[PDB]
Amino acid sequence: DRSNLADWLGSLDPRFRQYTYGLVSCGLDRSLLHRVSEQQLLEDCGIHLGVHRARILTAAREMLHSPDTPDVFISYRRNSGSQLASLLKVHLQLHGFSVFIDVEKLEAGKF
Amino acid sequence: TKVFSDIGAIQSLKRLVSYSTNGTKSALAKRALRLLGEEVPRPILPSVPSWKEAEVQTWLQQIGFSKYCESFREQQVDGDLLLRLTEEELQTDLGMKSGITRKRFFRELTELKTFANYSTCDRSNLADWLGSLDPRFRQYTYGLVSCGLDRSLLHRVSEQQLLEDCGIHLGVHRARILTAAREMLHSPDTPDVFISYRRNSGSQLASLLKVHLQLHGFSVFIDVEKLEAGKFEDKLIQSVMGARNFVLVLSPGALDKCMQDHDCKDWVHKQIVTALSCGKNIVPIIDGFEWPEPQVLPEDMQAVLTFNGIKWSHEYQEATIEKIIRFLQ
């Protein structure tokens, strides 16, 4: 369940969480949910209780409006500076720099 | 060893070795299955729709439905039929009584259909389109290319068609395909050059030039010297007379049959004449040619020696090509 549809359904009503798998199998996710029909919910996703369909479907429709250049490069000896290299990258990536690392393993493709 | 079997590891490993692409993940899988002792399955050829009854039996065994191999052979299901099996056929004809078993079958099939290489049957790469909507959709490729839909036609299909014709069963899925389809409504005697040459000597250079020039946006024609019929090959010269540019491949002695060809019957001789006649842009390409006396040629073609030619070099092929193009009009 990539979209935590479980928790969404679970917010409508804890008893709804049971329909998770049936919905993630028809492939619906949170973004698609705004488009499903009563019929789909019934046949495809196997929600059987009309009352339940209707509530899911409704809350779905309220989800219609409620859905070569890195910054830095680190060059270093893989044998000695490998440690510092990674460490910096991490730190800088946290701080909003896209970094690149001297992956020294490759010789092909016009030197 | 009984651990792995019960943990549900063996069948999982088999799949990593059946529908594999990566070398490593597959090496490892092979090793593991051997280490457990269980036979290692050979990978599946992915081009399903061109599979014979033999390959269907192999996959039936690697997804363990061997109970059924016999019925599949007796009804000689092959590649095409496999990809098109319905629940009914599976139940009745192939004799899979259990709904739950049908369901596990189809689940295995859908994995196949998704790994399939559909190149032989899909001219419009509908596979990749469907696969962009959602990787799980790629499984409908064959069903759509069989109703003949292609990318250009897709904008016109109905929900009903998708359901019945192409056998997409899940409404939800139909609806998404159909929608993205509708967004695809708005998102759906004279060659330039002729090369005349001796098929025995200049055949090499001829082709080479054509290729190079075709890359560079000239439509070329070649001296396919094999034909004598149809009013002394008048069709041959319709091409030359129409060919704005005329490349002559001058190999060492390319003008042998042209030499004193008074009947104008040698195709090379003929062409030279007709090009000269039409006042065509003649570019001789010099690759070992020693220039003869014009008098040894018929008068109608003597003047072809009076066109400035280009030295051929295989070594700096591209450079030579650019100069030749420069000389073309």
Place this chain on the structure above:
Amino acid sequence: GAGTEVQDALERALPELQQALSALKQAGGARAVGAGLAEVFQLVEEAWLLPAVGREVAQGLCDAIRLDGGLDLLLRLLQAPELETRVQAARLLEQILVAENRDRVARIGLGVILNLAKEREPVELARSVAGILEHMFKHSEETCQRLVAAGGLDAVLYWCRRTDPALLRHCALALGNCALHGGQAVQRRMVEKRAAEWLFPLAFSKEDELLRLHACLAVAVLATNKEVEREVERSGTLALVEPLVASLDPGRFARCLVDASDTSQGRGPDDLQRLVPLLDSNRLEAQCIGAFYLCAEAAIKSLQGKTKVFSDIGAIQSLKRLVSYSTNGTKSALAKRALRLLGEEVPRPILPSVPSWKEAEVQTWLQQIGFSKYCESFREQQVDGDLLLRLTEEELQTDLGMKSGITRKRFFRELTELKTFANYSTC
């Protein structure tokens, strides 16, 4: 008998590989490795006579160099700036390159192979490099996918504008393997690299007949890829196929396929299952190259008394269709020959004017699409031409007694092929 000799070989060859391993330690500047290379290359060339002497002794000698042999040392020898001897290593590597070595060098050698591929000008080198690439391409989906993208294809294509039999033969075989073994993706890339138009030189050279056949097998397989069909068609090289298959004789090239050393295009159940696609295509340029080759094997394999291959490969029924609904003389001559060479009776072509067919012609076609189980019911209900073209599922089920839905389905599929070939002029 064979093993005794293989063992005998290894008893000399392995210490000879060690005699080489001593030399393998140094460089070829002073021909320290140079002699050693010249030795072991020719030693495995003397042992390359053994696959012929026996049947594919290649494995034995190769495994020696692989498992513990200086296989990796030869890969490093390529890297070694002893260009004079790096071609000698390449020559040797090209030789010692069975499936075993191929997989191993796919892990390591691959990188160095391509690093050495970027070297172009040295012709002798290039020959051996295009050589290793040719074997490499025929390894795995991902191995192609690699080489193609990495300029391995771009190497063989830049060497396709050269003038050297072996170089050219190799390039042709490569683009062959690359088209065959590689995926959809690989193929698209080739055609978009202008590979179809680059096979033209090879296919247009009366000088070399085998080069042509190889060159055309390649372009033919590309045209089976419906998605790239048109681009191959407009290349011009696709028209150039059919004449060629007429010229040569399958028998003649069958002899030349005995001694393919399973390095070029050796006889095997693999190749057969990869030709059947062609025999089964739309393009008749493919169905020609298809039949030609499958006929060359229909010779050898019957001589080896192993016909059972074709039957199982699904080749026989495919061939029958090429001889039933045929138009072209060549593609049909070839088909007839092949079926005779396998011994299986050759079907007479079908008269295409279906709707004027009598009950007799319906029985004949029922037999050539193998539904003989049903011939009797078709005669008892005296189905003729008109009725055949109009059969419904219901009639087929009930009246003609085809119980199985799946069988009905295969029937109709065969019928639709008929209806499409039909001459409907009378009606």
